[PDB]
Design a protein around this ligand. Structure first.
Ligand SMILES: [Mg+2]
Ligand SMILES: [Mg+2]
Ligand SMILES: [Mg+2]
Ligand SMILES: [Mg+2]
Ligand SMILES: [Mg+2]
Ligand SMILES: [Mg+2]
Ligand SMILES: [Mg+2]
Ligand SMILES: [Mg+2]
Ligand SMILES: [Mg+2]
Ligand SMILES: [Mg+2]
Ligand SMILES: [Mg+2]
Ligand SMILES: [Mg+2]
Ligand SMILES: [Mg+2]
Ligand SMILES: [Mg+2]
Ligand SMILES: [Mg+2]
Ligand SMILES: [Mg+2]
Ligand SMILES: [Mg+2]
Ligand SMILES: [Mg+2]
Ligand SMILES: [Mg+2]
Ligand SMILES: [Mg+2]
Ligand SMILES: [Mg+2]
Ligand SMILES: [Mg+2]
Ligand SMILES: [Mg+2]
Ligand SMILES: [Mg+2]
Ligand SMILES: [Mg+2]
Ligand SMILES: [Mg+2]
Ligand SMILES: [Mg+2]
Ligand SMILES: [Mg+2]
Ligand SMILES: [Mg+2]
Ligand SMILES: [Mg+2]
Ligand SMILES: [Mg+2]
Ligand SMILES: [Mg+2]
Ligand SMILES: [Mg+2]
Ligand SMILES: [Mg+2]
Ligand SMILES: [Mg+2]
Ligand SMILES: [Mg+2]
Ligand SMILES: [Mg+2]
Ligand SMILES: [Mg+2]
Ligand SMILES: [Mg+2]
Ligand SMILES: [Mg+2]
Ligand SMILES: [Mg+2]
Ligand SMILES: [Mg+2]
Ligand SMILES: [Mg+2]
Ligand SMILES: [Mg+2]
Ligand SMILES: [Mg+2]
Ligand SMILES: [Mg+2]
Ligand SMILES: [Mg+2]
Ligand SMILES: [Mg+2]
Ligand SMILES: [Mg+2]
Ligand SMILES: [Mg+2]
Ligand SMILES: [Mg+2]
Ligand SMILES: [Mg+2]
Ligand SMILES: [Mg+2]
Ligand SMILES: [Mg+2]
Ligand SMILES: [Mg+2]
Ligand SMILES: [Mg+2]
Ligand SMILES: [Mg+2]
Ligand SMILES: [Mg+2]
Ligand SMILES: [Mg+2]
Ligand SMILES: [Mg+2]
Ligand SMILES: [Mg+2]
Ligand SMILES: [Mg+2]
Ligand SMILES: [Mg+2]
Ligand SMILES: [Mg+2]
Ligand SMILES: [Mg+2]
Ligand SMILES: [Mg+2]
Lengths: 93, 54, 110
RNA sequence: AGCUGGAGAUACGCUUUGACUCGGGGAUGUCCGAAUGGGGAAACCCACCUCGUAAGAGGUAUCCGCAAGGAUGGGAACUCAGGGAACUGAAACAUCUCAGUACCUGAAGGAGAAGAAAGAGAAUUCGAUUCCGUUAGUAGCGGCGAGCGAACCCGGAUCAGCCCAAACCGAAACGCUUGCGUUUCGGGGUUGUAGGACCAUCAAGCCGAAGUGGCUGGAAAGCUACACCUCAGAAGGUGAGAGUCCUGUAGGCGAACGAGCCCUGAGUAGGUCGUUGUUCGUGAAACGAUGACUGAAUCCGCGCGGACCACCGCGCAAGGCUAAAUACUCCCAGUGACCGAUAGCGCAUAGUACCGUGAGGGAAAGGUGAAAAGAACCCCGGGAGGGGAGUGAAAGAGAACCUGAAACC
RNA sequence: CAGUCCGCGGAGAAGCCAUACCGGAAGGAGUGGUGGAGCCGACUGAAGUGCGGAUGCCGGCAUGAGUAACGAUAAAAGAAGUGAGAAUCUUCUUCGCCGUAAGGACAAGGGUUCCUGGGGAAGGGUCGUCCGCCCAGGGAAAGUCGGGACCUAAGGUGAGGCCGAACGGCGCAGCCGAUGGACAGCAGGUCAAGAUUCCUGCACCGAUCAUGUGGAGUGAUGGAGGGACGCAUUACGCUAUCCAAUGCCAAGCUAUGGCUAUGCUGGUUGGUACGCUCAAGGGCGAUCGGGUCAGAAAAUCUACCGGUCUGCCUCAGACGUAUCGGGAGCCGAAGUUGGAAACGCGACGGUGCCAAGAAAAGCUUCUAAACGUUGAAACAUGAUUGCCCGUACCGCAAACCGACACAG
């Protein structure tokens, strides 16, 4: 319904440093629109979204064994919440 | 009632995906096992749809 | 690319069956079926000693080991024995229910 | 009883309340594409209408028809049809041939076409259509040149002929000076030795006979001493050459669901003008075939018998349907005095790499070993490479891994 | 290659390699050496059956030869680092070279070449510890920028419609189609790598709703205006922006023979809000009424026709106050005076010319129909909403087109 939409939280030092600021970022399905992902976050974790941005990301084109191939195209999506932030306490721990 | 158990499966499935992006995923089998329970779910629903109504 | 089963992914032995070797230096040696790989025709019995060497690998340890291990073999062991060793196998005799096709040489089971 | 795709790699696990895998159905099936809500530079943009809680589901192109319900597109070769070459031969080249070939385009199926005599033909025989053999390079056509080339008889493969208009009854609706006639429905009626009216099994699979000791060897299937089975000695695997180790083979069984035998057709027959097909190139040129202009006859009637006439024979046109024998081979099995890595399909796989804006062109191919036992460990070197050691029958096999010829160093 | 015999073979086949032997030749044997799994001899049958040549084909290897060159004559030198190894990689200090470029920003077009950590086979015309190369992992954020959910030009489509052996050729409306019209924000900060996107400050836009004022008229796929456009010259004000100084501010020295600062070096404002502040330049006349024959009919809106009396609106930009930034520098100073000056802004200015210079919606104004006229139009505040695609990096070039890290 909408749990399927959220492909994975973004890892990496920048997403963590933002996660310290109360904004959260994850990869979502490339077909996903801004409204449905805002609603999917508001369903999946119960916080209100207050800001959004998204960015399609073609995969790095990589090669193994003289077989050259495109990798799956992601869609990163970053969102800021109102003062009831903190998401579920799944931070860096 | 079927949709409730479907979506309850979907939530933990996405939780497993979220850990799997992280270093924690000790039981990958639970991944695919969670999906067949979804499919069986949907399948059985169709198996009732034709039944009775004909 | 050549499948290696000219024997139709059939196997004349179960896992855990006692078995004797027909050919090679192991002819006339004895062993239970520890691992049965049908489509490849590979058979593991205890006693097919093989000295695999490795302390080059890091993963097990910065060194490692020479060590004694099994070397699986072709369905060139005798599949099943009896007080008479070797020998072929009749089937289709009935179990106490009859639902189990069984085995015999001159006569017997398993 | 294993399974967890190739894929060779770890971890996580599923399975004897039946996994996998194999046959049979179901159910999901994102977007493009005939694409079909509308747009568009395919796989992406933008909507509307009902369900209406929402997530989500369904509909929204055009053509034929009331309405079901059809159709659009694709398909290697095969079929039919609308158009229709030129090299070339003619030792030049116009008619001719090359050829209704190649090609384009349309329709369609597992075939298609054609087909149930207004015929062939010369015995007053034949009796649908298609295909093979033959007649036969006979007849014949041809700047009578290059060349082009039938049909009947006869022999086989396969053989089924079935249905409607129309004279006449019952209208019914409509058409007129009064028991009548334009197109609709049932009856009836389908022809030439004239007929007809109206009046006398294969699928997934299971079972399946029979050998042991010694020898060489690294290894046994070779050799050897004795045997056994055979409705089975086809074949492939196994450390090398196995009827008797495996898988099979001969034979036998085998399923809930599964595929498969007074009338008889007119703007037409006929004709003139342009043309054309069969051997038919204006030739004495019949006949079919149609563009233009015309335009008959009815059963004491009509078409043909190669200008034309009389006689003598064959046959009834202008409405339809019709299996099989016939063609091909994208695909499956079987087989081979077929290839075996420059051969063989281009490909031991790839329409990939690469070349091209494009249509399109387009490769090299391979081999440890029995089994990975795929070289622990030590030495020189960052390595790479190498020497020892081991594994192994062989390291005179070591992964630039069968042999390892010649140029050449 | 095939049929049939004879047989051979892990005590080792074919194949490969030497060889003084043998037949008249094509040829064939003996022995030895590799090789490691099939094969010779005889009789017969069938052939893709015998190579030095075809500027033959596929392939490998020679000669030229350690030869020509190493891709602009904008030179490079020392220290110090790293390291198995350095003329070439890193850093430091000098040097030289472009500077309407050889700097910067975009569009194409390419597609991860961007950043970090690693690597060293091959690509790099030498090297290589380095790279635009190999590996892995990150980076790419928009209600306001460009496009789309708007419009139209050429052009392409195209129900109907006109034609045409077929496929198809045209074709009114409509639709697609930017290269054009239309449209709401600027100043600053910063990951290793994004920025009118994110963060910070403070604006605007449209939409929905609420509170209230107002408390009633809204006012179309149709009419009308307007949007709506050429070139050359040219007057006035101004900004960007640059110059000067014994203006201010900041920091320290100096020495060579001198200057003791009036010397040296560097800085010397961006946005927003508010003004009885200064301001060129620019726009605009204004209603009453008549006629049907004009805009399909309507119309209080346009056009035609008659009567009727400098002024308004406007800020380009400057100046002040405040504020928010930035700001040389060792957290934060100063912000002056004079001048120069755009193709930019005021503007859709003036004047001259002839070759006589898009369309369309948005937009302003009218009624038709319809909906109401005690829950209008509009306005004010609060709240709520803000979709899709693009954005990394190269981008006069080592990352695009030239088969190349190419003098184009
Ligand atoms: Mg945002
Ligand atoms: Mg490689
Ligand atoms: Mg070593
Ligand atoms: Mg495997
Ligand atoms: Mg579409
Ligand atoms: Mg379409
Ligand atoms: Mg000629
Ligand atoms: Mg000619
Ligand atoms: Mg053809
Ligand atoms: Mg065709
Ligand atoms: Mg068709
Ligand atoms: Mg014997
Ligand atoms: Mg055999
Ligand atoms: Mg004629
Ligand atoms: Mg002639
Ligand atoms: Mg080949
Ligand atoms: Mg070769
Ligand atoms: Mg090919
Ligand atoms: Mg490629
Ligand atoms: Mg090596
Ligand atoms: Mg060697
Ligand atoms: Mg060798
Ligand atoms: Mg090797
Ligand atoms: Mg071999
Ligand atoms: Mg070799
Ligand atoms: Mg020998
Ligand atoms: Mg010789
Ligand atoms: Mg061998
Ligand atoms: Mg041979
Ligand atoms: Mg030849
Ligand atoms: Mg010669
Ligand atoms: Mg030659
Ligand atoms: Mg050559
Ligand atoms: Mg010289
Ligand atoms: Mg030289
Ligand atoms: Mg030169
Ligand atoms: Mg230097
Ligand atoms: Mg020094
Ligand atoms: Mg050092
Ligand atoms: Mg080196
Ligand atoms: Mg230093
Ligand atoms: Mg530049
Ligand atoms: Mg681009
Ligand atoms: Mg870089
Ligand atoms: Mg780096
Ligand atoms: Mg290198
Ligand atoms: Mg080099
Ligand atoms: Mg450098
Ligand atoms: Mg965006
Ligand atoms: Mg913003
Ligand atoms: Mg725009
Ligand atoms: Mg057109
Ligand atoms: Mg346009
Ligand atoms: Mg533009
Ligand atoms: Mg704007
Ligand atoms: Mg930082
Ligand atoms: Mg930047
Ligand atoms: Mg000019
Ligand atoms: Mg001075
Ligand atoms: Mg008004
Ligand atoms: Mg300019
Ligand atoms: Mg319009
Ligand atoms: Mg940029
Ligand atoms: Mg990009
Ligand atoms: Mg060139
Ligand atoms: Mg260049």
């Amino acid at each position: 319904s909408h749990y399927d939409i959220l492909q994975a939280p973004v890892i990496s030092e920048k997403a963590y440093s933002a996660m310290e600021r109360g904004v959260y970022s994850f990869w979502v399905s490339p077909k996903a629109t801004k409204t449905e992902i805002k609603d999917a976050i508001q369903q999946a974790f119960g916080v209100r979204v207050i800001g959004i941005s998204t960015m399609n990301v073609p995969g790095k084109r990589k090669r193994v064994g003289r077989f050259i191939g495109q990798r799956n195209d992601r869609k990163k999506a970053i969102v800021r919440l109102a003062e009831g932030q903190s998401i579920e306490a799944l931070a860096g721990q | 009632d079927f949709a409730k158990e479907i979506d309850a499966r979907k939530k933990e499935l996405m939780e497993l995906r979220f850990q799997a992006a992280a270093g924690q995923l000790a039981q990958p089998h639970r991944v695919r096992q969670l999906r067949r329970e979804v499919a069986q779910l949907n399948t059985v629903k169709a198996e009732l749809a034709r039944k009775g109504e004909q | 690319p050549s499948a290696g089963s000219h024997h139709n992914d059939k196997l004349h032995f179960k896992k855990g069956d006692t078995v004797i070797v027909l050919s090679g230096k192991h002819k006339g040696q004895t062993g239970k079926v520890l691992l049965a790989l049908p489509r490849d025709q590979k058979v593991v019995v205890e006693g097919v000693n093989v000295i695999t060497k490795n302390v080059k690998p890091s993963m097990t340890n910065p060194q490692g080991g020479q060590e004694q291990r099994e070397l699986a073999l072709h369905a060139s062991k005798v599949a099943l024995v009896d007080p008479e060793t070797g020998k072929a196998t009749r089937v289709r005799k009935q179990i106490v229910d009859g639902k189990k096709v069984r085995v015999a040489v001159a006569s017997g089971k398993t």
